[PDB]
Design a protein around this motif. Structure first.
Motif, PDB file in Angstrom:
ATOM      1  N   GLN B  44       2.654  14.455  24.246  1.00  0.00           N
ATOM      2  CA  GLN B  44       2.354  13.625  25.407  1.00  0.00           C
ATOM      3  C   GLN B  44       1.903  12.205  25.028  1.00  0.00           C
ATOM      4  O   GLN B  44       1.957  11.324  25.878  1.00  0.00           O
ATOM      5  CB  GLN B  44       1.330  14.290  26.329  1.00  0.00           C
ATOM      6  N   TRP B  80       2.921  -9.554   9.252  1.00  0.00           N
ATOM      7  CA  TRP B  80       3.362  -9.073   7.945  1.00  0.00           C
ATOM      8  C   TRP B  80       3.291 -10.206   6.889  1.00  0.00           C
ATOM      9  O   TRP B  80       2.827  -9.981   5.777  1.00  0.00           O
ATOM     10  CB  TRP B  80       4.772  -8.473   8.024  1.00  0.00           C
ATOM     11  N   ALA B  82       1.217 -12.589   6.875  1.00  0.00           N
ATOM     12  CA  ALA B  82      -0.215 -12.889   6.661  1.00  0.00           C
ATOM     13  C   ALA B  82      -0.968 -11.800   5.882  1.00  0.00           C
ATOM     14  O   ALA B  82      -1.841 -12.113   5.055  1.00  0.00           O
ATOM     15  CB  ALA B  82      -0.912 -13.169   7.995  1.00  0.00           C
ATOM     16  N   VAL B  83      -0.644 -10.526   6.148  1.00  0.00           N
ATOM     17  CA  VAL B  83      -1.445  -9.401   5.617  1.00  0.00           C
ATOM     18  C   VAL B  83      -0.656  -8.367   4.792  1.00  0.00           C
ATOM     19  O   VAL B  83      -1.244  -7.409   4.280  1.00  0.00           O
ATOM     20  CB  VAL B  83      -2.260  -8.644   6.714  1.00  0.00           C
ATOM     21  N   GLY B  84       0.655  -8.554   4.676  1.00  0.00           N
ATOM     22  CA  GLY B  84       1.502  -7.589   3.987  1.00  0.00           C
ATOM     23  C   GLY B  84       1.515  -6.298   4.766  1.00  0.00           C
ATOM     24  O   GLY B  84       1.664  -6.319   5.982  1.00  0.00           O
ATOM     25  N   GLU B  85       1.366  -5.199   4.029  1.00  0.00           N
ATOM     26  CA  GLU B  85       1.393  -3.840   4.558  1.00  0.00           C
ATOM     27  C   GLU B  85       0.037  -3.305   4.974  1.00  0.00           C
ATOM     28  O   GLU B  85      -0.079  -2.120   5.313  1.00  0.00           O
ATOM     29  CB  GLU B  85       2.010  -2.906   3.507  1.00  0.00           C
ATOM     30  N   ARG B  86      -0.997  -4.158   4.929  1.00  0.00           N
ATOM     31  CA  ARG B  86      -2.379  -3.748   5.217  1.00  0.00           C
ATOM     32  C   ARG B  86      -2.546  -3.046   6.569  1.00  0.00           C
ATOM     33  O   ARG B  86      -3.343  -2.126   6.673  1.00  0.00           O
ATOM     34  CB  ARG B  86      -3.342  -4.944   5.134  1.00  0.00           C
ATOM     35  N   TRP B 220      11.350   6.265  -2.188  1.00  0.00           N
ATOM     36  CA  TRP B 220      12.512   5.509  -2.686  1.00  0.00           C
ATOM     37  C   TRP B 220      13.286   4.769  -1.601  1.00  0.00           C
ATOM     38  O   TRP B 220      14.067   3.861  -1.908  1.00  0.00           O
ATOM     39  CB  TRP B 220      13.488   6.426  -3.445  1.00  0.00           C
ATOM     40  N   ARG B 222      13.422   2.221   1.253  1.00  0.00           N
ATOM     41  CA  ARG B 222      12.712   1.041   1.802  1.00  0.00           C
ATOM     42  C   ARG B 222      13.653   0.138   2.599  1.00  0.00           C
ATOM     43  O   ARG B 222      13.404  -1.069   2.776  1.00  0.00           O
ATOM     44  CB  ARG B 222      11.976   0.307   0.682  1.00  0.00           C
ATOM     45  N   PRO B 264       7.627  20.570  24.424  1.00  0.00           N
ATOM     46  CA  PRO B 264       6.826  19.770  23.475  1.00  0.00           C
ATOM     47  C   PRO B 264       6.918  20.220  22.016  1.00  0.00           C
ATOM     48  O   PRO B 264       6.339  19.570  21.137  1.00  0.00           O
ATOM     49  CB  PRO B 264       5.395  19.945  24.004  1.00  0.00           C
ATOM     50  N   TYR B 265       7.616  21.327  21.770  1.00  0.00           N
ATOM     51  CA  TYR B 265       7.632  21.953  20.454  1.00  0.00           C
ATOM     52  C   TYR B 265       8.972  21.737  19.767  1.00  0.00           C
ATOM     53  O   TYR B 265      10.006  21.668  20.434  1.00  0.00           O
ATOM     54  CB  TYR B 265       7.282  23.441  20.559  1.00  0.00           C
ATOM     55  N   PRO B 288      16.499  11.692  -5.410  1.00  0.00           N
ATOM     56  CA  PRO B 288      17.458  11.170  -6.375  1.00  0.00           C
ATOM     57  C   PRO B 288      18.168  12.253  -7.199  1.00  0.00           C
ATOM     58  O   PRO B 288      19.381  12.151  -7.414  1.00  0.00           O
ATOM     59  CB  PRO B 288      16.588  10.266  -7.259  1.00  0.00           C
ATOM     60  N   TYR B 289      17.433  13.290  -7.617  1.00  0.00           N
ATOM     61  CA  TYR B 289      18.033  14.334  -8.462  1.00  0.00           C
ATOM     62  C   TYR B 289      19.106  15.154  -7.742  1.00  0.00           C
ATOM     63  O   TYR B 289      19.919  15.810  -8.401  1.00  0.00           O
ATOM     64  CB  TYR B 289      16.963  15.251  -9.077  1.00  0.00           C
TER      65      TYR B 289
END
Ligand SMILES: Cc1cc2nc3c(=O)[nH]c(=O)nc-3n(C[C@H](O)[C@H](O)[C@H](O)COP(=O)(O)OP(=O)(O)OC[C@H]3O[C@@H](n4cnc5c(N)ncnc54)[C@H](O)[C@@H]3O)c2cc1C
Ligand SMILES: Cc1cc2nc3c(=O)[nH]c(=O)nc-3n(C[C@H](O)[C@H](O)[C@H](O)COP(=O)(O)OP(=O)(O)OC[C@H]3O[C@@H](n4cnc5c(N)ncnc54)[C@H](O)[C@@H]3O)c2cc1C
Ligand SMILES: Cc1cc2nc3c(=O)[nH]c(=O)nc-3n(C[C@H](O)[C@H](O)[C@H](O)COP(=O)(O)OP(=O)(O)OC[C@H]3O[C@@H](n4cnc5c(N)ncnc54)[C@H](O)[C@@H]3O)c2cc1C
Ligand SMILES: Cc1cc2nc3c(=O)[nH]c(=O)nc-3n(C[C@H](O)[C@H](O)[C@H](O)COP(=O)(O)OP(=O)(O)OC[C@H]3O[C@@H](n4cnc5c(N)ncnc54)[C@H](O)[C@@H]3O)c2cc1C
Ligand SMILES: [F-]
Ligand SMILES: [F-]
Lengths: 359, 359, 360, 359
Positions: B44, B80, B82-86, B220, B222, B264-265, B288-289
């Motif tokens: 909800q 973003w 100004a603060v990156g990923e903060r 990996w 991004r 909801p499930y 990756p493997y």
């Protein structure tokens, strides 16, 4: 096959659901609630704010309450005999002192080891009557987690949902998605939330009795103490100071009984008040190393062992709890709400009456 | 002096509250909500189920949606830088592919680094158009935590409370206890919950668009990928597959768009569907493997890195969000609800409009 | 059955113990160590300080080191192909750049995807040679936890104990209480601690090469970079800058190579040095939002994502590792120590030689 | 400017270091140890294996031990008066029972609330003498953490290092890197580890007395009980059963006194022995709900509240602790080791003598 709804996951709804599922094995039970036992504490959810102790307020002439309270004591005490503290129960000597009265409630004589004590031996002054007996305390978070596990094991489906009206259980597609078909029956265990679910005259009968508590870490305290000032007046009248120790070493100090007071946040002056009164009725609540200090200095020692402050609203009602059979939106309705300050000590009794009414 | 209520603590309510408090420093603002960002996930509460990525659905002719989406991108991208990923933001290349269409939305050309790609280079078959551009993802739990901290710093009072009707804000003692005086104004940012607060014709315009997602641990990844099947139809139509990577290494895989579905499930077959489709549009989502393995074995590799399954109801509304000034129950009311699958990508734009309407 | 002791619970001891137990030669294995992998980091325990990457130092003419390093690569790479990152392994492209040299080690050509790059494309100046190839990194805490679980499963007894001398294994009641009978054999996998266990004139051969590293949270970095300055000199000579990313998003930045330096604590100026050099060789180590800023501001951005500083002492030895059979204190002794900066990349190869020496 | 070494970070080393730094503020003190208090429990590190209680073993004619024990009591009791249980101290009533003896040690009469009891009232058979007095228990992990914080605040430098010989302190590059200059002095507080650091006659004086304990969660127990069987013999002879409750609700049950036994792992038959004997001397150790059950069911009830099994080696020495000034390998050496089963109850006394001998 048609769903049976238990509306509420406080102590009242969960005990109702347990007794329902035990009476009718494999029944189609769905428990709906907008607050669940393991949720963060909220003043609107009474069951985890509670101390809780078993200390009946049942008037000598209130046969229903006496029956509920003693039935509930029997169930809890048998459970403690079987599992000890595993579900949050602790047997203890409860001491009650009265500052005015020259009698105790007859209901207490049903507990083991009932004794009338010399009121002059109370640590605070003006005590005119004093008794002790074996009772129990409950760590509500632990016990409610055990009830939640139990209803899961018995096959209940559990849903986090808000129910805006009883009719919505039949009509609202968000609720119908949970249990598919309109319910055959609903147990309304909504506590003070029932005010939004019943017609205006019944809604008017419900009111909060606000209670603030201070929880301290005091595992040296494994006995219970209560001081009653003023008449119960056939209900839950007057004011109480209490020491309610849990098996986990947290001890609940209280209390306040503010009728119609909806303030959900603790008041600083009430914290001071509770700590001061707790020291009066139970000097040993103080950290052992501080017990010889001037009484004024021991408040700061108590402050230093505070775990949390908490506030709750007792779901109060004139005449006590409503446990009754009715009808709404073509469903069979059992009301089980309005237990005031006595939900924990009456839960199993009420649950059994509620299920019997449905059946 | 008279309280101003923000009803809702999803992304819409919290951005509204930030802009309100920034425009009118020291205003008497009380934020009421029955679900807060750091609460456990619940279908909800849409704001913490979301991916979330900034991927506009704004039709070329939908000037209001285009303006909101671009404004929100500018605010988030500035943040973003100004603060990156903060605060949970991550700039990335977003690639969108269409299975059927030979055009993209004009709105995307407003993003940095917009490129039209060769559709034959898509890893899955039947792709007829493909573009990429710089966009952002948001880890909503992290960003909402920053919004919560921000409104506190700006002096908002925060309350956990359920509002049964708009009138209740002025009349209900349980709510009046929070802010004392009857409110002058309310920003209704109740998401899909607005259906319980508005007249039936407005309530009928709202419906859930259910979305199931699978969150995997795939740090990996991004870059973002979406495949659109079917027409948007001037709204949010058709179906999407997406890979939405968060800065914390959780990657949200989806999705479904089930209109009117209140379940909801999560559904087991839908988990399989999502992992299968994710691999089609983005082979590198696989560990990756596992990348050289047959297709079925790779679904198994994705299962091995599942963090959680989740379901949410998008607050869809016929004609898109309601952002409008009105009067109700003696208050100045600004509605700001019904953002469908686009609340995160439009929030700041909508918040600024809402505050302007109130002012 | 007389106890067979593995002395040491670093990477060398644990791989030795695994190979010993897997030999199925009836060995009653007791592993004794005064530091275990999940203990708090300590400069004296090299195994969890390490990056670690597989980046051979094996001279073209050092056949033993080449064989060890490539064998260990095969074991680790096959493990990664079987279980992915579950035990802390991550396959990656390793790029090595040289400042001065005009060739690479022959050993690298054995790795997958080997290539000679154009050194003019290096991000830093003065690069004269550059290669890349597929290699692996290891998150040592994770991998060592997997080895510890493995030796338990195979039936080894694990003991926390300090061994004051090899003789003490047979004569000291505090040690005898662990395994009852005097041991028949001991694998001495004591790392730099071997300086207190081997005959005293052999101890001068062992020395610390101190390494300081800075661990940052940089999960965007999944490629490896190393810059080699000066000649290896047939051993592990010269200095390196490196970026060693782990599968858990921690990236180890380094390094220093201070022979005879026993200082176990990180130096402030070295933190600054490492961060600065890391940025030179791998501009993308910087947080994405920081990549356009002046170099000084990017150093500050790197400081903001620091997880920890760490220092370790590489168990250096002239000639490389001692893997050799001896007889001491009445026991059959196999030495397996002195791996310097290459213990992780040679561990399985050394373990197998050590077990073969014991088995005879 | 020349470093002063405290070798050891058990209770003995850390008390020595505290007194050292308090006597000579700003002194150049370096504490070296291969095991620190917060490390995982190890049978070789006695200080965190200990109960610990203050229950003197000092013979009536052992002036030194009586002085040490009572000084240490004074220091700990004063600390408990100042801070309560903050650093792990808990005042309690200690009850000692003897199975044979008709006298108590004179040293006990220095404790508050000393009283001789009726030995007929002991819960177990063949008790011939019984006393109680106020004493203290210590949760050693908490107390040692406080000592560690204290030495840091007083300016000590702390190092994790193994010292192979005292000479190595002046000559080993691995140790010289810690403090730069060859040390002027070393306080040798190596416990049983001193056996590797002293000449062969002094090393032969040292031996382990192995003790196994069972730790239970029994916060109902805040009183201490010990049963002494056999003669102390002017030392720590004979065998003891004990209940040592900590302020955190852990209660240490013991014990064994195996001289020369180097086995570091708990024996299953000894667990049974300890639980059985604990129940003999203190029936209230059993969970309250189990106290009326048959003996075997009570042993099982105790097993159900077990927190951990532990084993330690008391650093026993002929003639008790060596607290002595000497010269070895170029340094002024103060030995402070070999405290047997009495290190906790004698620590502050020994520390003060050790600092005096150096000064
Ligand atoms: C400070 C304090 C101390 C106390 N001490 C004691 C004591 O020592 N002993 C004792 O016996 N009692 C004590 N009580 C009283 C006891 O706490 C209450 O009587 C009891 O908890 C009430 O239980 P309930 O299940 O009816 O209500 P609640 O615990 O409030 O639960 C109601 C449930 O209904 C749900 N609900 C309500 N409305 C809706 C809706 N519209 N839709 C969906 N869900 C809904 C809620 O989410 C919740 O799950 C104390 C109370 C307080 C405040
Ligand atoms: C699977 C999924 C993926 C999505 N992905 C994206 C994406 O990638 N990008 C994007 O832009 N958007 C996405 N969305 C959409 C986005 O999540 C919603 O549009 C947005 O969160 C709506 O925010 P809200 O604040 O209006 O509603 P909510 O988050 O639902 O919050 C509503 C608030 O109102 C409160 N409330 C409601 N009624 C009452 C009442 N009566 N009393 C008290 N409080 C009340 C609730 O407690 C809550 O605090 C996604 C949605 C889903 C379900
Ligand atoms: C900063 C740094 C970075 C590195 N990076 C890499 C890399 O990228 N790749 C690579 O291949 N290598 C690398 N290394 C080298 C690698 O860490 C070592 O060569 C390897 O860890 C040595 O392993 P070991 O088991 O011999 O020693 P240790 O890990 O030191 O273990 C020795 C064991 O012996 C025990 N012990 C010693 N003496 C005694 C005694 N008397 N009694 C009981 N127990 C004893 C210890 O308790 C411990 O269990 C690096 C090293 C450093 C310092
Ligand atoms: C089961 C049990 C119960 C007990 N109960 C009690 C009780 O109730 N009351 C009581 O008073 N006493 C009790 N004791 C005794 C008490 O635990 C010891 O007397 C006391 O802990 C000894 O302290 P220590 O500092 O000398 O030794 P330890 O705590 O063993 O500390 C020795 C220190 O020296 C270090 N060290 C040693 N050698 C070296 C080296 N070569 N290099 C570097 N560091 C080194 C170790 O790492 C450690 O830091 C009990 C003991 C046991 C085993
Ligand atoms: F409601
Ligand atoms: F040693």
């Amino acid at each position: 096959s048609d769903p049976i709804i238990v509306l509420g996951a406080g102590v009242i709804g969960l005990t109702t659901a347990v007794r329902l599922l035990e009476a009718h094995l494999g029944a189609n039970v769905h428990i709906l609630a907008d607050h669940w036992p393991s949720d963060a504490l909220d003043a609107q959810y009474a069951s985890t704010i509670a101390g809780a102790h078993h200390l009946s307020f049942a008037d000598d002439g209130d046969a229903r309450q006496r029956r509920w309270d003693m039935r509930t004591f029997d169930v809890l005490y048998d459970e403690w005999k079987a599992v000890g503290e595993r579900t949050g129960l602790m047997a203890l000597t409860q001491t009650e002192m009265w500052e005015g009265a020259t009698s105790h409630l007859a209901v207490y004589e049903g507990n083991p080891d009932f004794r009338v004590l010399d009121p002059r031996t109370a640590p605070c002054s003006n005590i005119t009557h004093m008794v002790s007996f074996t009772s129990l305390t409950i760590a509500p978070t632990v016990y409610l987690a055990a009830l939640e596990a139990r209803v899961r094991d018995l096959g209940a489906k559990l849903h986090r949902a808000h129910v805006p009206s009883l009719g919505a259980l039949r009509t609202d597609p968000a609720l119908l998605a949970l249990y598919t078909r309109p319910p055959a029956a609903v147990f309304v265990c909504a506590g003070l939330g029932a005010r939004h679910l019943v017609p205006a005259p019944e809604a008017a009968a419900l009111f909060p009795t606000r209670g603030q508590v201070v929880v301290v870490r005091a595992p040296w305290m494994r006995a219970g103490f209560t001081r009653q000032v003023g008449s119960l007046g056939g209900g839950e009248g007057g004011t109480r100071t209490y020491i309610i120790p849990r098996c986990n070493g947290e001890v609940v100090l209280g209390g306040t009984m503010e009728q119609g007071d909806w303030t959900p946040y603790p008041r600083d002056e009430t914290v001071t008040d509770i700590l001061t009164r707790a020291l009066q009725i139970c000097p040993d609540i103080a950290p052992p190393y501080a017990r010889s200090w001037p009484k004024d200095d021991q408040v700061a020692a108590l402050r230093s062992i505070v775990v949390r402050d908490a506030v709750g609203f007792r779901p109060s009602r004139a005449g006590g709890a409503r446990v009754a059979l009715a009808s709404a939106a073509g469903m069979r309705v059992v009301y089980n709400y309005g237990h005031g300050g006595a939900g924990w000590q009456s839960c199993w009794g009420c649950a059994e009456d509620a299920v019997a009414l449905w059946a």
